Design a protein around this ligand. Sequence first.
Ligand SMILES: *[C@@H]1O[C@H](CO)[C@@H](O[C@@H]2O[C@H](CO)[C@@H](O[C@@H]3O[C@H](CO)[C@@H](O)[C@H](O)[C@@H]3O)[C@H](O)[C@H]2NC(C)=O)[C@H](O)[C@H]1NC(C)=O
Lengths: 52, 48
Amino acid sequence: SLSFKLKRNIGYFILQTYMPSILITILSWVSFWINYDASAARVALGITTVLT
Amino acid sequence: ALIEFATVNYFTKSQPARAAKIDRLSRIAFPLLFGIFNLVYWATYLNR
Ligand SMILES: *[C@@H]1O[C@H](CO)[C@@H](O[C@@H]2O[C@H](CO)[C@@H](O[C@@H]3O[C@H](CO)[C@@H](O)[C@H](O)[C@@H]3O)[C@H](O)[C@H]2NC(C)=O)[C@H](O)[C@H]1NC(C)=O
């Protein structure tokens, strides 16, 4: 038996799927600084965030 | 751009002068920044 042990690099995933999700959550948090009278803006934010 | 809009809407209805000022500043500060970034990027990656 010849056996290797391959360790996967995490740079590409940090680039592709961790950073967009983190920044999408950061974007979702903006929905609190908008005034609570705006009914379409915060819903647009939340819906776009869920969809992304 | 989105955070700038959030700040403007947070300052609106309370301090409209500051909101209008930061909006008028961003109007010039964003295109110039993107232009000089494009200049730097294409210059450093087309010379190699
Ligand atoms: C990758 O996986 C393989 C198998 O899953 C690992 O091989 C295993 O290595 C251990 C440690 O060398 C073996 O134990 C041995 O038992 C014999 C019994 O006499 C002893 O003489 C040795 O000194 C050692 O203690 C184990 O048998 C072996 N697996 C099999 C099925 O034989 C391997 O370590 C894993 N890691 C790498 C980097 O390959």
